[PDB]
Assembly symmetry: C3
Homo-oligomer: 90 residues x 3
Amino acid sequence: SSETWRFDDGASLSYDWAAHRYRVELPSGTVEVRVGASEVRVSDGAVSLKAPKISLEGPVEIAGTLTVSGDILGGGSIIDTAGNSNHHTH
Amino acid sequence: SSETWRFDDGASLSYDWAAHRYRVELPSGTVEVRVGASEVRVSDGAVSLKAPKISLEGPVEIAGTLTVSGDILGGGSIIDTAGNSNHHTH
Amino acid sequence: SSETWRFDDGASLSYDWAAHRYRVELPSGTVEVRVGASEVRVSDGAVSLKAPKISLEGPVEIAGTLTVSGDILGGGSIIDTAGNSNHHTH
Ligand SMILES: [Fe+3]
């Protein structure tokens, strides 16, 4: 169903024609693509996106906790399940 | 302005020197880059980032609805347009 | 510690075996990967993800301000530091 090439570095490339799935895998290290001042980096510890604007076009689902250093501005409702702040007055 | 290579799989590579734009395109399937336990995957149904930390460095603009399974913690204001919860007490 | 290849376009590829770090760099332009209707694009002005679903699996840390055009739905608490709306009633 698939084939794999293993490189001298331990990295591999695999291609499953029964899925059209291409996989590049490194056991450890960092892969980075930079264009101007924008970067996508994939490393053992993180996936990092850095750019003048990071645009996510579609429904976004975070499986985890979201921490934002700056403000959070929503064009609709902002609805919790377990608690929000009383940092406002009626 | 550009040139294109079409592969036997239906995939293509194109390069516009009048924009310095490189495009790799697959009609269907999955492309994945894995480094350690971190992954970026692009498939017909999703773009998926999986990592011990997902770092977005810059202004983030979501064109869509954001769902977070865990908590949302903001270092500044969290301001809606259309409604927030009363899950707090004055 | 590393080696670099510089292309006729000003782009470069570098590999540090003392880090297993691969870097592709373009001074200016756009690099795009498309699979079906999903895309990851890296350009001078932005990193853009577009897909039927954008899945972020792990803790997400935004260093910047987050703007969401649609709703924000949290499965836990949503806690600010500096202010939230009074768009609700007790
Ligand atoms: Fe209140």
